[PDB]
C-alpha cells in the first residue's frame, strides 16, 4: 500500500491519500486484533 504514496507529481497527493488511510486503520486493525477482539471473544462466545 505504501509505495504509491511515493508517486509524487500532481497525481502523488491523490494516491498519497489512499495509501495513508489504508496503512493507518490497518495498523489500528492489528492493534485492535490484540486488544478488543481477543478479550470480547473470551468475554462473549459459545
Amino acid at each position: 500500500f505504501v509505495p504509491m504514496a511515493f508517486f509524487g507529481g500532481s497525481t502523488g497527493a491523490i494516491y498519497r491519500q489512499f495509501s495513508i488511510t489504508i496503512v493507518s486503520a490497518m495498523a489500528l486493525s492489528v492493534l485492535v486484533a490484540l486488544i478488543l477482539t481477543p478479550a470480547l471473544c473470551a468475554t462473549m462466545l459459545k
Partner: protein
C-alpha cells in the same frame, strides 16, 4: 457659463443627466427575466465547503432588509454536490458494515457472537478519522473510498 445676456448655461443644457451603471458590459438574466448576481471564486487554498457556509450566512443577514420584491436565488453552485457526493459514499460505508453483520450470521448464527468481528470494524474506522485528523488530512472522496476499501 454666463453669456452677454442674462441667460446662463447649466450642465443640464448640454447633456442628459442620469443615474446609470459604471460600465454596461455585463447584462445578466435568470431564466430570461431581469437579474443580477455575484460570481464567487475560492481563495487559493481556502476550504470550499466552509467558505460557502459563510457566503450563505452573510446573505442570511442581508435579506431582512431588501427592497420590495428582491429575492436571492441560487443558480450555479458546486457545493451541494460535494456534500451529497461524499455523504452517499458514507452511506455506502454504513450499509456495508450492516451487510457484514448478516454474512457473519450465515457462517456463525449467534446474536451476540456476530458483533465481535462487526463491532471491531467501526472501532478501527472511527480511529482512522482521528489519525487522519492528526496527520492534517481531510475527509475527502479519495479518503472515504480509502475506508470502504479498508473495510
Amino acid at each position: 457659463k454666463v453669456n452677454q445676456d442674462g441667460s446662463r448655461v447649466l450642465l443640464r443644457d448640454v447633456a442628459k443627466i442620469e443615474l446609470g451603471g459604471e460600465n454596461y458590459d455585463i447584462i445578466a438574466e435568470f431564466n430570461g427575466q431581469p437579474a443580477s448576481g455575484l460570481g464567487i471564486k475560492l481563495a487559493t487554498g481556502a476550504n470550499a465547503l466552509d467558505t460557502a457556509a459563510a457566503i450563505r450566512a452573510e446573505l442570511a443577514k442581508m435579506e431582512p432588509f431588501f427592497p420590495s420584491g428582491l429575492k436571492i436565488v441560487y443558480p450555479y453552485d458546486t457545493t451541494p454536490f460535494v456534500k451529497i457526493s461524499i455523504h452517499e459514499v458514507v452511506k455506502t460505508l454504513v450499509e456495508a458494515i450492516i451487510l457484514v453483520f448478516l454474512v457473519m450470521y450465515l457462517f456463525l448464527q449467534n446474536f451476540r457472537a456476530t458483533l465481535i468481528p462487526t463491532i471491531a470494524v467501526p472501532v478501527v474506522l472511527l480511529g482512522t478519522f482521528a489519525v487522519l485528523a492528526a496527520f492534517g488530512f481531510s475527509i475527502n472522496t479519495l479518503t472515504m473510498f480509502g475506508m470502504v476499501l479498508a473495510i
